[PDB]
Ligand SMILES: [Ca+2]
């Protein structure tokens with residue numbers, strides 16, 4: 001019972017940048033393309049019926065040469081790091097995976113750029129562990 005969160009669907013809260021569709025290979029209607037600024041984020045919300053460990057999978061494209069690593073923070077601060085190396089092209093997508101603890105109830109998940117390049121393009125977030133559904137943005 002994984003939860004797959006796409007742009008333009010319940011549980012997708014914000015991108016500092018735009019939702020774009022001009023590179024092939026994404027899923028849903030697009031992908032998030034952040035501003036080129038550190039701290040630029042993609043934000044989702046997840047409701048968990050019980051606290052407990054989840055595995056998050058972030059599908060992403062990085063057509064630049066440099067890593068564009070992310071800070072992943074839950075409820076404005078768990079604080080995690082996500083490594084986001086080059087995928088070799090803006091049309092090649094890979095996944096980065098990270099285990100986190102979610103609390104029972106609402107979990108605002110922010111993935112933010114650690115560098116001035118912003119994040120790679122972010123296609124989707126997948127969440128596995130217990131019962132999780134779209135949360136409340138805000
Ligand atoms: Ca997508």
Ligand code: NA
Pocket residue numbers: 017033034035036117118119120121
């Ligand atoms: Na960008």
